[PDB]
Design a protein around this nucleic acid. Structure first.
Length: 65
RNA sequence: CUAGUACCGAUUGAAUGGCUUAGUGAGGCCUCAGGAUCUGCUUAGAGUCAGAGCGGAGAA
């Protein structure tokens, strides 16, 4: 069930090279983003003028143990 | 499998520079012309009323 990689180096840089090529929105774009968000967590959101709220992308397999 | 290194070699792709055939050529300067306008003199208008004629300067 665990992911196994072999050459970490050759996998790492190969993945990055594709990702910049497949980019849909790029630096300096104005964007709206729609996130499938479980509504019960909404109680934890704070006013973004008082508290920093930030969003990060993930690379393909980074979710796998 | 990755790295490096060079060779051709495809589009002139897409540019920069030297030499070169043919053709064209801005601008000011010199020179042949032109004469919007302004103005002096003169017999002459009326007793400024005009006209004519002889000069000087001079922009496009």
């Amino acid at each position: 069930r665990l992911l196994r990689i072999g050459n970490y180096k050759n996998t790492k840089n190969r993945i990055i090279k594709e990702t910049k090529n497949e980019a849909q929105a790029i630096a300096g774009d104005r964007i709206r983003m729609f996130i499938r968000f479980p509504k019960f967590l909404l109680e934890k959101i704070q006013d973004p003028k008082q508290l920093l709220f930030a969003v990060y992308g993930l690379l393909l397999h980074e979710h796998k143990n």
